[PDB]
Design a protein around this ligand. Structure first.
Ligand SMILES: CN[C@@H]1[C@@H](O)[C@@H](O[C@@H]2[C@@H](O)[C@H](O[C@H]3O[C@H]([C@@H](C)O)[C@@H](O)[C@H](O)[C@H]3N)[C@@H](N)C[C@H]2N)OC[C@]1(C)O
Ligand SMILES: CN[C@@H]1[C@@H](O)[C@@H](O[C@@H]2[C@@H](O)[C@H](O[C@H]3O[C@H]([C@@H](C)O)[C@@H](O)[C@H](O)[C@H]3N)[C@@H](N)C[C@H]2N)OC[C@]1(C)O
Ligand SMILES: CN[C@@H]1[C@@H](O)[C@@H](O[C@@H]2[C@@H](O)[C@H](O[C@H]3O[C@H]([C@@H](C)O)[C@@H](O)[C@H](O)[C@H]3N)[C@@H](N)C[C@H]2N)OC[C@]1(C)O
Ligand SMILES: [Zn+2]
Lengths: 249, 91
RNA sequence: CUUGGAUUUACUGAAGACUAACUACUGCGAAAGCAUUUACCAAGGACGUUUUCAUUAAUCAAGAACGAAAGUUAGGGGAUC
RNA sequence: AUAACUGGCUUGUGGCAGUCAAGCGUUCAUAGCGACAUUGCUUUUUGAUUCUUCGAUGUCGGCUCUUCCUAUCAUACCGAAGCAGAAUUCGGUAAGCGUUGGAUUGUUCACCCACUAAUAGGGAACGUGAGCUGGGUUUAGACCGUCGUGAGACAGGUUAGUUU
RNA sequence: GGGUAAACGGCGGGAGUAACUAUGACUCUCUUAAGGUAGCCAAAUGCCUCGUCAUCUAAUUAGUGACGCGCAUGAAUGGAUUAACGAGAUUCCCACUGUCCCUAUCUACUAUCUAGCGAAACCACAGCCAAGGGAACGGGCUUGGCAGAAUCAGCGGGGAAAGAAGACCCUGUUGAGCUUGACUCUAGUUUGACAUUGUGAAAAGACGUUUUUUUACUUAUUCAAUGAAGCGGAGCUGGAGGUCAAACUCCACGUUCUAGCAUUAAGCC
RNA sequence: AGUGGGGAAAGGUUCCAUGUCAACAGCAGUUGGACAUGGGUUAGUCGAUCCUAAGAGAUGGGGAAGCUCCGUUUCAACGUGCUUGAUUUUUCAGGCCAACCAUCGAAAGGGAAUCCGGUUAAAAUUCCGGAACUUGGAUAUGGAUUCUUCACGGCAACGUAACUGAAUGUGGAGACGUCGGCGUGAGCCCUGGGAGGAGUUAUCUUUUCUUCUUAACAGCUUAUCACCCUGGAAUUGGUUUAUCCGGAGAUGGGGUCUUAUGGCUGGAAGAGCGCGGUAAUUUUGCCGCGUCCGGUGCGCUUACGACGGUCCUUGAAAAUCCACAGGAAGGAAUAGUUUUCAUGCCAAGUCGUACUCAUAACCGCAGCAGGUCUCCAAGGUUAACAGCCUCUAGUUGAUAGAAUAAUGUAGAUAAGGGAAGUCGGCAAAAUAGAUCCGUAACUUCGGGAUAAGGAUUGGCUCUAAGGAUCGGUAACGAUCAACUUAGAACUGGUACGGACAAGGGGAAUCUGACUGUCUAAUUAAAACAUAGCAUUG
RNA sequence: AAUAGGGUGAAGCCAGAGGAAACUCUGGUGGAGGCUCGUAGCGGUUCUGACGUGCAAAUCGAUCGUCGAAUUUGGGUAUAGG
């Protein structure tokens, strides 16, 4: 047969992300002395649209502690943050929307976003519009905090890892239907080349494991082992179950 | 005169996409294009620029918000929850 | 279902419901209904009045508000039955 | 050296014709029929075979047009009758002359409607594609049903498909 | 051994039974993982089949509506609908007309003839018929009919005319595209051992050394950040813990109404 | 919306003049993109050159037997740094810093600066004549500034001829989608008077046609928006075609700013144009006069402005230039500045530049009915940049002559019938614009719908309605002006969307929801995609 | 970089009418849409038309689909033979 579309994506030729119009990577400030021991104050200059991202971003200006120079930062804007607001980041930052605090300084049930997995990686968790991380409990002796991720998973993180108070803005995008192929076209026009999607059963056997036959059908189980090799993993990879989910989970 | 009985703003879609899909769009598009009261200057001049971005044409202040409304229910709950946890901690 | 220890014992914890006992020939509400604490919001019957208006009223086709449970749509929850 | 047309041999099968005469026909085998048997003919069916053609004979039907056969549907003349007349039936010489218009089907075939003197059957490389047409069949696109794990299969159905 | 079908897929027979008959609500039995549910249908899916009935027509293997033991319908291998849309398939009707009855006439450009210019396909030799025999359909051979130069415009009977070493079929110990529970392997991936690979402790084992389990160290090694900027320890200040010896624990140690400013040190010894 | 006038790609001398006809231009040839001999392409201002884009790619390095692969925010001791007080001793001395930056990548993106007239056989925003501009440098003069050292004025928005400002920091410009109506300007179109010239003239047309123009650049001036001062608002007012604005200060009154765009003047009438005359076998002319004053708009195109809509889409980068914050340093009195005020001086390199841009200069074997990116755009009819006729400009190229049989190809018409033809209405016919009337089932309430189906339409002569600017119950008078709509009379071989242009419709079934997409060269579909739905990691 | 001229008439806005009320109705304005008729453009249905030793190794005529977006297109750039 032939190399399937799955396999062709990894060479990254026509499948690289479309980044010309993007407004910069969204990150927290690097952990420095000020955020480790006290707090530092910045001001929101702009709240802007980032193409390919549902959540708006905030450009925030901070003084450089060590030389006469301004520093601009690209944050993920939480809902309620506004231009001209002061943003406090550090260990002594107050518990207000938009402030960047370590997770150890937030009581049970604090809603937080753009949360670090490891201390100082500048944010990995709860970054999309309408999403957030819940703080479940504290383990002060071990310096570990337990949090609830958007997917429902529970995770133990260092209490020195930071997060931003509030909910990521722009929530509710998916509530409105797209209604049109053209809206999807415009959506992925600034993300990557992954649309439209041809069905594997509509192809010939060279093109895809699902192709061929005098009727369109898969012909073998679409649940594929985790240990299958590239070119075989099309369908439902390592599925624990299939079919309509009924009841609770 | 009342030009359309029920389609409202989704009259631009004609007879396409199905009535349920158009009716679901109507609920969010009315909120999307509505004027909101600014919490800073007190005028009804807040409109959406893009998803999650709400500008006031009067005082020129932009606040991050929801995709189709200025404030979502989850964000409102967080303000009270963050308000509450703030004083229970500072006391 | 259980020797992979089920059931039973103690501690901590997580969920959603529900509001026992007090509770009655007792209360309120147009009816459907309404039962943990507290605070706020506006509403109400009765009573008391040497206050006020002066027939403004009764019942009502048409036309409207509310309306257990079950059932429907979309989210969220989904312990128990 | 070998199948799928035509052609050739064959003629079971198909079609057509005889001989005998048990019975039918109010009695009367033979006007008209004709069982049980039995002799043939034809190549307008389908087989059997594999002789010719695989450095290719354009492979359905229709349309168009000519001609030929006779085992004669009509028309000419006549013989027979269980021929009173009328109508009808059997038979002879006869192919000179004609043998139609439509609904459904790609159809040959089939089946109805109607007209007509009559609406006979056949051949000519299953006449006729450098005459057409291209509905069907019979490349590649696509759908369904059954079958197959699958790729795919199906004298099963369906739609689109360059005629030098 | 457990779960999973909006995974691949699958979704039954045989007997009897109602007071005319017929049918069978009802019963028995065999059997499955389950025995096709809601719907839908001679449908683009039904062989039989041009199914049967009705409608449409003078007449309908077409169309439509019904019926359903359905060769072999059927539920995201999606079922049944469905307004709007369609150079999609199909039937009927109105309008329309040379599609036809049944053909006629007209125009331009060709064809035609001329001056000039001037190819190609194809070609064993060639070129009138009937019969015969013959590789079983001859231009040539045998026997007949016959048979007179040179030619022009047309024509599509024949030259089994031309175009291409049949694309169908079969053979070949010739392939190739594709598939899989074919034979034989393979990238990847996973699992163990050994090496990289050092320094301790406790507890179970077996003859001062050793097997196993856990857990301690940091310098090998691995991950990450940075323009390698504030690390580790101690101390100076305060505050709380009521101290009692005596300074013993813990905490902090310059920035939070506001979209300003902070850079090239003052001061002191 | 060209058979007109230019260009990009591609070609490469095909350009022009002279000569020439063997071959080539499928006839011809005295002609030619042919053949031969010569000539021809002039830049500080137009491009390239520079910048960065997607991307490409060296370098300490890490792989690979290696050709080489990987990395460029690259585990690196990475400046061939910069500014001073000067020293010339071609030596010094300090002080600032080094986050980023090898390099390549656009003749349509970004970007310093030029116009008009004339001129050749063939070049011109390149030459000539005149008039400007930019950048870099040098530097003199004047002006400005200083005894209150680094200017004044205005309540303010801010104004000006100038009117110190190091490191460092910051801001702006460069620099950005798309659609809708509205406003303004320019060019074009239309139009009156007058001054010339041409035409028609049997008759007539105060007539038919034509000329009457004004660059870059310099000065003054000129604006929507925005902003400032005053003042303090419900009897809410102002206000757009589009409903937004006002105690966060409206309406009213008075000012400030951007100069897009227009006006006047200089450039500049000396040019160009139109008439008339004259020398002359003439190079090249020389002279006279004029070249003026208005109107109009749902016109066309184009630029700009103020607005409004739209997105699960929010619509480059860099070079480069400016400004600000800062307060280092240096500056006065009988004296330092600054070339961001005026004037003056010097210079601007390299390569491209002819021509074609196509029914003959490119690619398709060729002078091939194919293919190949883009700018400008007149009158009439009209909704119209469609179709039809015309002006400017350009062609008149495609072998020709004589005839007009059959069969063709392209196009027409046909009595009566009206799909009987055929697999099938294939093909053809029928319908068609605009105004008014009328419009079913069904439906996702949006549609279906131009459903179906009727009536009307010419010409001529009239009438009515819809405005602008001036001037004080001005409900008026005056002056001016665009075509829309409506009605009436009269009239004709009943014609009239008179050519052109221009839907046939209805009742159902199957199927895919829809718009969209593919088998370049036999299949456009019911196939693919799609939104929606579900499952998996 | 490019895309005549029409039709329909979505939200928003103004004005009026009806009603006891809840509410309802009308006339304008506006100018939405992978809306529609239809040029240029892009495509390629049918005649199974022409041609089929062609003008042409895919063309020519008519008839057609679509025509403001999943639109058309120049140049630059990336992806390379199991
Ligand atoms: C012109 N229409 C005709 C119609 O007339 C009719 O034709 C038949 C024809 O088919 C019959 O013929 C048919 O039937 C005979 C049989 C009866 O013997 C067969 O032998 C013959 O092969 C067959 N074609 C012929 N015997 C009479 C015509 N009217 O049926 C056929 C038709 C086309 O519809
Ligand atoms: C055991 N030796 C290690 C040696 O391997 C190495 O460590 C690198 C480290 O330098 C890299 O990290 C480095 O390089 C990355 C780059 C790859 O993007 C940089 O982004 C990063 O700033 C830089 N610290 C890290 N990403 C991997 C380690 N093995 O250097 C550190 C070391 C201790 O010598
Ligand atoms: C499934 N087996 C195939 C096997 O058949 C074969 O494939 C060849 C392929 O390699 C050939 O192709 C070869 O030659 C061609 C060309 C020069 O002819 C090249 O373009 C190509 O690079 C070269 N690999 C191709 N022409 C035929 C296939 N069957 O090669 C091995 C294989 C890919 O595994
Ligand atoms: Zn505001």
């Amino acid at each position: 047969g032939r190399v399937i579309r799955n396999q062709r994506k990894g060479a990254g030729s026509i499948f690289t992300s479309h980044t010309r119009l993007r407004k910069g990577a969204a990150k927290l400030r690097t952990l420095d002395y000020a955020e480790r021991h006290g707090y530092i104050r910045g001001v929101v200059k702009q709240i802007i649209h980032d193409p390919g991202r549902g959540a708006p971003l905030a450009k925030v200006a901070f003084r450089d502690p060590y030389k006469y120079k301004l520093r601009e930062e690209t944050f993920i804007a939480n809902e309620g943050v506004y231009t001209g607001q002061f943003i406090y980041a550090g260990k002594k930052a107050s518990l207000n929307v938009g402030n960047i605090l370590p997770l150890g300084a937030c009581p049970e049930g604090t809603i937080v976003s753009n949360v670090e997995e490891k201390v100082g990686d500048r944010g990995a968790l709860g970054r999309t519009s309408g999403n957030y991380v819940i703080i479940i409990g504290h383990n002060p002796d071990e310096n570990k905090t337990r949090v609830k991720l958007p997917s429902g998973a529970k995770k133990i993180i260092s209490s020195d890892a930071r997060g931003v108070i509030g909910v990521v803005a722009g929530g509710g995008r998916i509530d409105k239907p797209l209604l049109k192929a053209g809206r999807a076209f415009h959506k992925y026009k600034v993300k990557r080349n992954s649309w439209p999607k041809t069905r594997g059963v509509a192809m010939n056997p060279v093109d895809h494991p699902h192709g061929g036959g005098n009727h369109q059908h898969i012909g073998k189980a679409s649940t594929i082992s985790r240990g299958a090799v590239s070119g075989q993993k099309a369908g439902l990879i390592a599925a624990r179950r299939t079919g309509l989910l009924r009841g609770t989970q | 005169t009342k030009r359309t009985k029920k389609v409202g703003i989704t009259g631009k879609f004609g007879v396409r996409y199905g009535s349920s899909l158009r009716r679901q769009t109507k609920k969010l598009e009315v909120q999307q294009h509505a004027k909101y009261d600014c919490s800073f200057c007190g005028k009804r001049t807040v409109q959406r620029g893009a998803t999650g971005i709400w500008n006031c044409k009067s005082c020129k202040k932009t606040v991050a918000g929801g995709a189709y409304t200025v404030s979502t229910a989850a964000a409102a709950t967080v303000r009270s929850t963050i308000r509450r946890l703030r004083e229970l901690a500072e006391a």
